[PDB]
Amino acid sequence: PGPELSGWISEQLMTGRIPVSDIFCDYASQRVIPVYQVNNLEEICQLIIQAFEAGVDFQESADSFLLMLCLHHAYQGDYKLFLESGAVKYLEGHGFRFEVKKRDGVKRLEELLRTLAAANAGQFLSFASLFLPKLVVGEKACLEKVQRQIQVHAEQGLIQYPTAWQSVGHMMVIFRLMRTNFLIKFLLIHQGMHMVAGHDANDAVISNSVAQARFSGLLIVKTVLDHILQKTERGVRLHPLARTAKVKNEVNSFKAALSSLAKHGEYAPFARLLNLSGVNNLEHGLFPQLSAIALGVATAHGSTLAGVNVGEQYQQLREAATEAEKQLQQYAESRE
């Protein structure tokens, strides 16, 4: 608050890094989120929804408007309760700052902040939650999942959404906003992670979505862990091929990456969704030998590991793992 005594902005402007028009216009930019305290929360939330349907890209206003939908739906308009919640505490530790802005007598979205001149919160939020299970997999996979689940939610009589929201157009708007916006992913995941009070069917949809999104983007590496873990009489050990000297570096890196994920506790299942620290170290392609061992074990039982591709350099190890497992199976079926 005051003058730029640092000299960073002046250096940036003088060297062509920030254009001159950004300050000399007719503003230049811990993330700050204004929390607009209004009297007609429900009316404002219906506007916010109408706006997202129209395709308004709120950019820096998205966080705030998404926050109001959640605050209305999950916290019943109780600003104080919301600002004290576990969700808000997590986000403050993650760099978010919440700043209340009392705003009386608002009848247009514009009064809060265009195309605005030219379906309840719960439904909007639950529709968005459908994107969680496969958001990180890709557009095609994600949208197909959404369409499939919409089939399921209807044939079960659970929840019906405007058919305008089911166009590829609209679905891509929500996909891109989910991809880009941490707050909405986090609040939906946080809600579905916990238990919720009431009889809103939307909340059951959200909880279901969050359940299906567990380990999303981590499913392949999880199945590799499964197939390199060995169930014995004396307990569970690491597959003995994974303890060979040529695999040692790989298993060291894996152990380290796996421990980083474990430090996120209850959030770990959503580490790829929320891009939590260290999660990029736990990508299956980084561990081609463990992957080969894993696929080897699977082949001996007639199974495949979708997403695992073992190159020729690792095929001998794959084949060795299959043979070790065949030998384990026959020496266990002998005692019978």
mmCIF file of C-alpha atoms in Angstrom:
data_model
loop_
_atom_site.group_PDB
_atom_site.id
_atom_site.type_symbol
_atom_site.label_atom_id
_atom_site.label_comp_id
_atom_site.label_asym_id
_atom_site.label_seq_id
_atom_site.Cartn_x
_atom_site.Cartn_y
_atom_site.Cartn_z
ATOM 1 C CA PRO A 1 0.000 0.000 0.000
ATOM 2 C CA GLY A 2 1.903 3.028 -1.293
ATOM 3 C CA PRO A 3 4.819 3.499 -3.675
ATOM 4 C CA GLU A 4 6.931 0.797 -5.372
ATOM 5 C CA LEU A 5 10.132 1.429 -3.413
ATOM 6 C CA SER A 6 11.410 -1.977 -4.539
ATOM 7 C CA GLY A 7 12.045 -0.704 -8.085
ATOM 8 C CA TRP A 8 10.913 -3.947 -9.646
ATOM 9 C CA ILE A 9 8.027 -2.453 -11.575
ATOM 10 C CA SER A 10 10.129 0.464 -12.833
ATOM 11 C CA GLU A 11 12.848 -1.975 -13.995
ATOM 12 C CA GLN A 12 10.212 -4.145 -15.683
ATOM 13 C CA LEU A 13 8.668 -1.156 -17.462
ATOM 14 C CA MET A 14 12.041 0.266 -18.457
ATOM 15 C CA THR A 15 13.251 -3.038 -19.954
ATOM 16 C CA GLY A 16 10.056 -3.839 -21.957
ATOM 17 C CA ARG A 17 8.908 -6.664 -19.657
ATOM 18 C CA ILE A 18 5.607 -4.987 -18.518
ATOM 19 C CA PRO A 19 4.115 -2.903 -21.350
ATOM 20 C CA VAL A 20 3.749 0.837 -20.667
ATOM 21 C CA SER A 21 0.001 0.797 -21.393
ATOM 22 C CA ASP A 22 -0.583 -1.571 -18.405
ATOM 23 C CA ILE A 23 0.112 1.197 -15.947
ATOM 24 C CA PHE A 24 -0.248 4.232 -18.224
ATOM 25 C CA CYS A 25 -3.779 3.113 -19.325
ATOM 26 C CA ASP A 26 -7.218 4.890 -19.548
ATOM 27 C CA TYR A 27 -3.907 -1.449 -13.067
ATOM 28 C CA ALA A 28 -1.113 -4.056 -13.304
ATOM 29 C CA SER A 29 -1.140 -7.502 -11.676
ATOM 30 C CA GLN A 30 -1.067 -14.966 -1.974
ATOM 31 C CA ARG A 31 -4.267 -14.879 -4.133
ATOM 32 C CA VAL A 32 -6.986 -12.491 -2.904
ATOM 33 C CA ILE A 33 -10.653 -13.523 -3.229
ATOM 34 C CA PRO A 34 -13.336 -10.989 -2.514
ATOM 35 C CA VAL A 35 -16.282 -12.507 -0.652
ATOM 36 C CA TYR A 36 -19.313 -10.427 -1.583
ATOM 37 C CA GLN A 37 -21.735 -10.183 1.342
ATOM 38 C CA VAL A 38 -25.115 -9.540 -0.269
ATOM 39 C CA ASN A 39 -28.769 -9.685 0.911
ATOM 40 C CA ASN A 40 -30.248 -11.503 -2.109
ATOM 41 C CA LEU A 41 -27.736 -14.435 -2.255
ATOM 42 C CA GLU A 42 -30.219 -16.672 -4.072
ATOM 43 C CA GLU A 43 -31.064 -14.093 -6.705
ATOM 44 C CA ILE A 44 -27.330 -13.390 -7.215
ATOM 45 C CA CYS A 45 -26.589 -17.127 -7.537
ATOM 46 C CA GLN A 46 -29.285 -17.495 -10.222
ATOM 47 C CA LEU A 47 -27.592 -14.663 -12.107
ATOM 48 C CA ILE A 48 -24.129 -16.288 -11.724
ATOM 49 C CA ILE A 49 -25.570 -19.530 -13.116
ATOM 50 C CA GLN A 50 -27.276 -17.788 -16.105
ATOM 51 C CA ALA A 51 -23.914 -16.112 -16.808
ATOM 52 C CA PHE A 52 -21.941 -19.436 -16.941
ATOM 53 C CA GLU A 53 -24.665 -20.895 -19.219
ATOM 54 C CA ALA A 54 -24.268 -17.886 -21.597
ATOM 55 C CA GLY A 55 -20.471 -18.501 -21.763
ATOM 56 C CA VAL A 56 -19.293 -15.441 -19.792
ATOM 57 C CA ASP A 57 -15.595 -16.031 -18.951
ATOM 58 C CA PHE A 58 -15.310 -14.229 -15.607
ATOM 59 C CA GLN A 59 -11.528 -14.665 -15.521
ATOM 60 C CA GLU A 60 -10.430 -13.098 -12.187
ATOM 61 C CA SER A 61 -14.038 -12.897 -10.999
ATOM 62 C CA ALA A 62 -14.596 -16.669 -11.274
ATOM 63 C CA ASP A 63 -13.306 -17.578 -7.766
ATOM 64 C CA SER A 64 -15.676 -15.076 -6.154
ATOM 65 C CA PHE A 65 -18.720 -16.147 -8.066
ATOM 66 C CA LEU A 66 -18.034 -19.833 -7.533
ATOM 67 C CA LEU A 67 -17.519 -19.110 -3.844
ATOM 68 C CA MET A 68 -21.017 -17.588 -3.641
ATOM 69 C CA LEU A 69 -22.664 -20.680 -5.111
ATOM 70 C CA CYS A 70 -20.886 -22.878 -2.553
ATOM 71 C CA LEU A 71 -21.518 -20.491 0.332
ATOM 72 C CA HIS A 72 -25.230 -20.457 -0.594
ATOM 73 C CA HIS A 73 -25.560 -24.204 -1.182
ATOM 74 C CA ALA A 74 -23.255 -25.708 1.466
ATOM 75 C CA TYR A 75 -23.302 -23.001 4.135
ATOM 76 C CA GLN A 76 -26.872 -21.655 3.707
ATOM 77 C CA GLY A 77 -25.672 -18.057 3.355
ATOM 78 C CA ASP A 78 -23.873 -18.120 6.697
ATOM 79 C CA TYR A 79 -20.791 -16.049 5.987
ATOM 80 C CA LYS A 80 -19.349 -16.362 9.478
ATOM 81 C CA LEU A 81 -19.638 -20.157 9.536
ATOM 82 C CA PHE A 82 -18.105 -20.416 6.098
ATOM 83 C CA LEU A 83 -15.148 -18.147 6.883
ATOM 84 C CA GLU A 84 -14.407 -20.287 9.986
ATOM 85 C CA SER A 85 -14.674 -23.686 8.219
ATOM 86 C CA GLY A 86 -11.997 -26.316 7.680
ATOM 87 C CA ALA A 87 -12.247 -25.698 3.924
ATOM 88 C CA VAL A 88 -11.378 -22.023 4.341
ATOM 89 C CA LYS A 89 -8.510 -22.856 6.698
ATOM 90 C CA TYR A 90 -7.001 -25.275 4.169
ATOM 91 C CA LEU A 91 -7.225 -22.636 1.445
ATOM 92 C CA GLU A 92 -5.590 -19.918 3.571
ATOM 93 C CA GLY A 93 -2.643 -22.267 4.176
ATOM 94 C CA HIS A 94 -2.549 -22.780 0.407
ATOM 95 C CA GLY A 95 -2.155 -19.047 -0.221
ATOM 96 C CA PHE A 96 -5.756 -17.816 -0.567
ATOM 97 C CA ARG A 97 -6.915 -14.616 1.225
ATOM 98 C CA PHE A 98 -10.613 -14.086 1.816
ATOM 99 C CA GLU A 99 -11.741 -10.427 1.937
ATOM 100 C CA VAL A 100 -15.372 -9.581 2.714
ATOM 101 C CA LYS A 101 -17.070 -6.877 0.697
ATOM 102 C CA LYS A 102 -20.513 -5.825 1.874
ATOM 103 C CA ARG A 103 -22.608 -5.019 -1.172
ATOM 104 C CA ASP A 104 -26.274 -3.949 -0.586
ATOM 105 C CA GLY A 105 -28.932 -3.403 -3.283
ATOM 106 C CA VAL A 106 -27.356 -5.380 -6.138
ATOM 107 C CA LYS A 107 -29.729 -6.356 -8.995
ATOM 108 C CA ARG A 108 -27.113 -6.971 -11.744
ATOM 109 C CA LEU A 109 -23.908 -9.067 -11.652
ATOM 110 C CA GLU A 110 -22.121 -6.050 -13.199
ATOM 111 C CA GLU A 111 -22.506 -4.157 -9.903
ATOM 112 C CA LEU A 112 -20.160 -6.693 -8.283
ATOM 113 C CA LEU A 113 -17.303 -7.179 -10.851
ATOM 114 C CA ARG A 114 -20.183 -6.782 -20.818
ATOM 115 C CA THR A 115 -21.950 -9.892 -22.280
ATOM 116 C CA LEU A 116 -24.061 -9.756 -19.085
ATOM 117 C CA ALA A 117 -26.293 -7.083 -20.691
ATOM 118 C CA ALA A 118 -27.550 -9.628 -23.304
ATOM 119 C CA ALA A 119 -31.247 -24.530 -12.389
ATOM 120 C CA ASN A 120 -30.267 -23.923 -8.723
ATOM 121 C CA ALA A 121 -26.763 -23.605 -7.138
ATOM 122 C CA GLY A 122 -26.913 -27.194 -5.994
ATOM 123 C CA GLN A 123 -27.669 -28.485 -9.475
ATOM 124 C CA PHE A 124 -24.852 -26.413 -10.955
ATOM 125 C CA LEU A 125 -22.391 -27.723 -8.395
ATOM 126 C CA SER A 126 -23.456 -31.326 -8.761
ATOM 127 C CA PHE A 127 -23.253 -31.096 -12.530
ATOM 128 C CA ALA A 128 -19.699 -29.835 -12.137
ATOM 129 C CA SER A 129 -18.854 -32.663 -9.740
ATOM 130 C CA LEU A 130 -19.557 -35.143 -12.566
ATOM 131 C CA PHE A 131 -16.434 -33.896 -14.279
ATOM 132 C CA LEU A 132 -14.196 -34.904 -11.374
ATOM 133 C CA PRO A 133 -13.785 -38.670 -11.962
ATOM 134 C CA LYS A 134 -12.052 -38.280 -15.387
ATOM 135 C CA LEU A 135 -11.173 -34.494 -15.591
ATOM 136 C CA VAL A 136 -7.437 -35.271 -15.545
ATOM 137 C CA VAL A 137 -7.696 -38.126 -18.070
ATOM 138 C CA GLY A 138 -8.743 -36.015 -21.046
ATOM 139 C CA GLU A 139 -11.664 -34.144 -22.622
ATOM 140 C CA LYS A 140 -13.137 -37.119 -24.513
ATOM 141 C CA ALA A 141 -12.905 -39.504 -21.559
ATOM 142 C CA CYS A 142 -14.187 -36.804 -19.202
ATOM 143 C CA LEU A 143 -17.204 -35.835 -21.244
ATOM 144 C CA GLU A 144 -18.125 -39.459 -21.951
ATOM 145 C CA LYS A 145 -18.015 -40.160 -18.208
ATOM 146 C CA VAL A 146 -20.295 -37.146 -17.605
ATOM 147 C CA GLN A 147 -22.805 -38.310 -20.275
ATOM 148 C CA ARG A 148 -22.798 -41.885 -18.919
ATOM 149 C CA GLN A 149 -23.386 -40.687 -15.387
ATOM 150 C CA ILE A 150 -26.218 -38.457 -16.533
ATOM 151 C CA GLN A 151 -27.798 -41.583 -18.000
ATOM 152 C CA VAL A 152 -27.328 -43.332 -14.635
ATOM 153 C CA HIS A 153 -28.663 -40.425 -12.506
ATOM 154 C CA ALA A 154 -31.838 -40.355 -14.610
ATOM 155 C CA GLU A 155 -32.614 -44.100 -14.921
ATOM 156 C CA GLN A 156 -32.301 -44.101 -11.078
ATOM 157 C CA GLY A 157 -34.602 -41.039 -10.848
ATOM 158 C CA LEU A 158 -31.898 -39.253 -8.818
ATOM 159 C CA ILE A 159 -31.226 -35.849 -10.546
ATOM 160 C CA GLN A 160 -32.156 -34.294 -13.921
ATOM 161 C CA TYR A 161 -30.212 -31.385 -15.483
ATOM 162 C CA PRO A 162 -31.285 -28.853 -18.145
ATOM 163 C CA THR A 163 -30.587 -30.417 -21.550
ATOM 164 C CA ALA A 164 -28.821 -27.193 -22.638
ATOM 165 C CA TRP A 165 -26.043 -28.082 -20.161
ATOM 166 C CA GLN A 166 -25.527 -31.373 -21.985
ATOM 167 C CA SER A 167 -24.264 -29.871 -25.257
ATOM 168 C CA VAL A 168 -20.538 -30.349 -26.040
ATOM 169 C CA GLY A 169 -20.301 -26.599 -26.020
ATOM 170 C CA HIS A 170 -21.499 -26.265 -22.455
ATOM 171 C CA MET A 171 -19.647 -29.325 -21.270
ATOM 172 C CA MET A 172 -16.390 -27.852 -22.650
ATOM 173 C CA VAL A 173 -16.987 -24.604 -20.800
ATOM 174 C CA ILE A 174 -17.301 -26.517 -17.505
ATOM 175 C CA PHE A 175 -14.348 -28.827 -18.382
ATOM 176 C CA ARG A 176 -12.073 -25.836 -19.072
ATOM 177 C CA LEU A 177 -13.263 -24.010 -15.943
ATOM 178 C CA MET A 178 -12.775 -27.139 -13.794
ATOM 179 C CA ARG A 179 -9.301 -27.627 -15.324
ATOM 180 C CA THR A 180 -8.247 -24.099 -14.579
ATOM 181 C CA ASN A 181 -9.995 -23.398 -11.235
ATOM 182 C CA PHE A 182 -8.529 -24.848 -8.039
ATOM 183 C CA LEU A 183 -11.171 -23.390 -5.700
ATOM 184 C CA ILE A 184 -14.161 -25.147 -7.284
ATOM 185 C CA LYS A 185 -12.353 -28.481 -7.398
ATOM 186 C CA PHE A 186 -11.262 -28.097 -3.853
ATOM 187 C CA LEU A 187 -14.641 -27.115 -2.442
ATOM 188 C CA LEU A 188 -16.407 -29.912 -4.264
ATOM 189 C CA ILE A 189 -13.824 -32.488 -3.181
ATOM 190 C CA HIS A 190 -13.885 -31.174 0.389
ATOM 191 C CA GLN A 191 -17.669 -31.415 0.551
ATOM 192 C CA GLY A 192 -17.833 -34.965 -0.887
ATOM 193 C CA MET A 193 -14.922 -35.988 1.349
ATOM 194 C CA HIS A 194 -16.951 -35.248 4.411
ATOM 195 C CA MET A 195 -20.393 -36.096 5.468
ATOM 196 C CA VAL A 196 -23.129 -33.625 4.834
ATOM 197 C CA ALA A 197 -26.300 -32.783 6.665
ATOM 198 C CA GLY A 198 -29.636 -32.687 4.941
ATOM 199 C CA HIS A 199 -31.700 -34.325 2.284
ATOM 200 C CA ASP A 200 -30.574 -32.500 -0.817
ATOM 201 C CA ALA A 201 -30.093 -35.047 -3.579
ATOM 202 C CA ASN A 202 -27.417 -32.815 -5.078
ATOM 203 C CA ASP A 203 -25.178 -33.524 -2.123
ATOM 204 C CA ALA A 204 -25.476 -37.252 -2.710
ATOM 205 C CA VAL A 205 -24.473 -36.726 -6.315
ATOM 206 C CA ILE A 206 -21.407 -34.687 -5.223
ATOM 207 C CA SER A 207 -20.400 -37.342 -2.615
ATOM 208 C CA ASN A 208 -20.748 -40.056 -5.257
ATOM 209 C CA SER A 209 -18.657 -38.064 -7.778
ATOM 210 C CA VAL A 210 -15.896 -37.478 -5.246
ATOM 211 C CA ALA A 211 -15.924 -41.179 -4.396
ATOM 212 C CA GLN A 212 -15.431 -42.108 -8.116
ATOM 213 C CA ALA A 213 -12.645 -39.505 -8.451
ATOM 214 C CA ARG A 214 -10.526 -41.168 -5.721
ATOM 215 C CA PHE A 215 -7.063 -41.920 -7.129
ATOM 216 C CA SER A 216 -8.093 -40.388 -10.452
ATOM 217 C CA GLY A 217 -4.939 -39.912 -12.504
ATOM 218 C CA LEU A 218 -3.163 -42.313 -10.111
ATOM 219 C CA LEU A 219 -5.031 -45.531 -11.036
ATOM 220 C CA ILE A 220 -2.205 -46.928 -13.203
ATOM 221 C CA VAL A 221 0.507 -46.348 -10.630
ATOM 222 C CA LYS A 222 -1.789 -47.822 -7.956
ATOM 223 C CA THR A 223 -2.301 -50.996 -9.954
ATOM 224 C CA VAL A 224 1.531 -51.224 -10.399
ATOM 225 C CA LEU A 225 1.964 -51.004 -6.619
ATOM 226 C CA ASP A 226 -0.696 -53.772 -6.278
ATOM 227 C CA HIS A 227 1.123 -56.124 -8.622
ATOM 228 C CA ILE A 228 4.594 -55.535 -7.101
ATOM 229 C CA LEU A 229 3.322 -56.147 -3.620
ATOM 230 C CA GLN A 230 3.455 -59.814 -2.611
ATOM 231 C CA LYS A 231 0.935 -61.469 -0.258
ATOM 232 C CA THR A 232 2.660 -64.200 1.755
ATOM 233 C CA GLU A 233 2.071 -66.452 4.793
ATOM 234 C CA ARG A 234 4.239 -64.091 6.907
ATOM 235 C CA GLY A 235 2.557 -60.904 5.544
ATOM 236 C CA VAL A 236 3.039 -58.474 2.625
ATOM 237 C CA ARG A 237 6.458 -57.903 1.066
ATOM 238 C CA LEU A 238 7.871 -56.138 -1.959
ATOM 239 C CA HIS A 239 8.231 -58.534 -4.927
ATOM 240 C CA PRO A 240 11.717 -60.078 -4.828
ATOM 241 C CA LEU A 241 12.452 -58.970 -8.470
ATOM 242 C CA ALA A 242 11.914 -55.419 -7.290
ATOM 243 C CA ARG A 243 14.813 -55.948 -4.828
ATOM 244 C CA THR A 244 17.361 -56.872 -7.512
ATOM 245 C CA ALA A 245 20.267 -54.503 -7.939
ATOM 246 C CA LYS A 246 19.218 -53.180 -11.374
ATOM 247 C CA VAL A 247 15.848 -52.023 -9.930
ATOM 248 C CA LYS A 248 17.337 -50.398 -6.796
ATOM 249 C CA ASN A 249 17.445 -46.796 -8.093
ATOM 250 C CA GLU A 250 13.901 -47.038 -9.408
ATOM 251 C CA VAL A 251 12.549 -48.431 -6.159
ATOM 252 C CA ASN A 252 14.430 -45.708 -4.185
ATOM 253 C CA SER A 253 12.756 -42.949 -6.340
ATOM 254 C CA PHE A 254 9.421 -44.679 -6.050
ATOM 255 C CA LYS A 255 9.657 -45.032 -2.247
ATOM 256 C CA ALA A 256 10.447 -41.276 -2.083
ATOM 257 C CA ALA A 257 7.654 -40.228 -4.436
ATOM 258 C CA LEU A 258 5.227 -42.514 -2.595
ATOM 259 C CA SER A 259 6.197 -41.002 0.757
ATOM 260 C CA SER A 260 5.588 -37.485 -0.585
ATOM 261 C CA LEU A 261 2.081 -38.507 -1.596
ATOM 262 C CA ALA A 262 1.474 -40.135 1.806
ATOM 263 C CA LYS A 263 2.207 -36.788 3.558
ATOM 264 C CA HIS A 264 -1.059 -35.454 2.008
ATOM 265 C CA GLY A 265 -3.094 -38.007 3.962
ATOM 266 C CA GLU A 266 -6.796 -37.854 3.237
ATOM 267 C CA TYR A 267 -6.098 -35.560 0.326
ATOM 268 C CA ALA A 268 -3.771 -38.077 -1.390
ATOM 269 C CA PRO A 269 -6.514 -39.745 -3.407
ATOM 270 C CA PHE A 270 -7.079 -36.342 -5.035
ATOM 271 C CA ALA A 271 -3.436 -35.395 -5.461
ATOM 272 C CA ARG A 272 -3.486 -35.485 -9.276
ATOM 273 C CA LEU A 273 -6.802 -33.512 -9.379
ATOM 274 C CA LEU A 274 -5.534 -30.842 -7.033
ATOM 275 C CA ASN A 275 -1.932 -30.952 -8.361
ATOM 276 C CA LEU A 276 -0.597 -31.316 -4.830
ATOM 277 C CA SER A 277 3.139 -30.967 -4.298
ATOM 278 C CA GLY A 278 5.231 -33.926 -5.527
ATOM 279 C CA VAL A 279 2.534 -35.741 -7.417
ATOM 280 C CA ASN A 280 4.418 -35.494 -10.754
ATOM 281 C CA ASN A 281 7.148 -37.694 -9.352
ATOM 282 C CA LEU A 282 4.636 -40.521 -9.084
ATOM 283 C CA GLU A 283 3.971 -41.056 -12.807
ATOM 284 C CA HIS A 284 4.150 -44.680 -13.989
ATOM 285 C CA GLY A 285 6.397 -43.938 -16.937
ATOM 286 C CA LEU A 286 9.164 -42.944 -14.535
ATOM 287 C CA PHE A 287 9.344 -46.540 -13.288
ATOM 288 C CA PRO A 288 9.554 -48.793 -16.356
ATOM 289 C CA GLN A 289 11.032 -51.788 -14.439
ATOM 290 C CA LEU A 290 8.350 -51.825 -11.680
ATOM 291 C CA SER A 291 5.837 -51.481 -14.437
ATOM 292 C CA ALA A 292 7.362 -54.484 -16.217
ATOM 293 C CA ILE A 293 7.419 -56.548 -12.995
ATOM 294 C CA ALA A 294 3.742 -55.511 -12.424
ATOM 295 C CA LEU A 295 2.611 -56.410 -15.948
ATOM 296 C CA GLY A 296 4.586 -59.665 -15.676
ATOM 297 C CA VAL A 297 2.750 -60.769 -12.539
ATOM 298 C CA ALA A 298 -0.601 -59.855 -14.202
ATOM 299 C CA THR A 299 0.096 -61.932 -17.371
ATOM 300 C CA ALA A 300 0.651 -65.064 -15.249
ATOM 301 C CA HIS A 301 -2.964 -64.712 -14.024
ATOM 302 C CA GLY A 302 -4.235 -63.945 -17.551
ATOM 303 C CA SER A 303 -4.814 -60.229 -16.835
ATOM 304 C CA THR A 304 -3.681 -56.962 -18.412
ATOM 305 C CA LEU A 305 -2.781 -53.627 -16.783
ATOM 306 C CA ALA A 306 -4.466 -50.955 -18.839
ATOM 307 C CA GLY A 307 -2.193 -47.990 -19.451
ATOM 308 C CA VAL A 308 0.996 -49.951 -18.866
ATOM 309 C CA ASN A 309 3.128 -50.373 -21.967
ATOM 310 C CA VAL A 310 6.367 -52.338 -21.566
ATOM 311 C CA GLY A 311 9.017 -51.466 -24.177
ATOM 312 C CA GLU A 312 11.516 -53.993 -25.617
ATOM 313 C CA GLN A 313 14.282 -52.864 -23.269
ATOM 314 C CA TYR A 314 12.096 -54.092 -20.291
ATOM 315 C CA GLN A 315 10.418 -57.133 -21.933
ATOM 316 C CA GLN A 316 12.945 -59.612 -20.486
ATOM 317 C CA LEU A 317 12.070 -58.465 -17.000
ATOM 318 C CA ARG A 318 8.353 -58.699 -17.842
ATOM 319 C CA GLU A 319 8.881 -62.248 -19.014
ATOM 320 C CA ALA A 320 10.937 -63.083 -15.912
ATOM 321 C CA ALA A 321 8.191 -61.755 -13.635
ATOM 322 C CA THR A 322 5.573 -63.893 -15.368
ATOM 323 C CA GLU A 323 7.773 -66.959 -14.839
ATOM 324 C CA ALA A 324 8.385 -66.195 -11.221
ATOM 325 C CA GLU A 325 4.620 -65.918 -10.691
ATOM 326 C CA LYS A 326 3.797 -69.065 -12.603
ATOM 327 C CA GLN A 327 6.322 -70.863 -10.338
ATOM 328 C CA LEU A 328 4.696 -69.349 -7.239
ATOM 329 C CA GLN A 329 1.205 -70.405 -8.303
ATOM 330 C CA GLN A 330 2.249 -74.025 -9.133
ATOM 331 C CA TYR A 331 4.159 -74.373 -5.835
ATOM 332 C CA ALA A 332 1.095 -73.131 -3.922
ATOM 333 C CA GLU A 333 -1.394 -75.308 -5.818
ATOM 334 C CA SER A 334 0.856 -78.336 -5.104
ATOM 335 C CA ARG A 335 -0.005 -78.151 -1.414
ATOM 336 C CA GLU A 336 -3.662 -79.142 -2.204
#
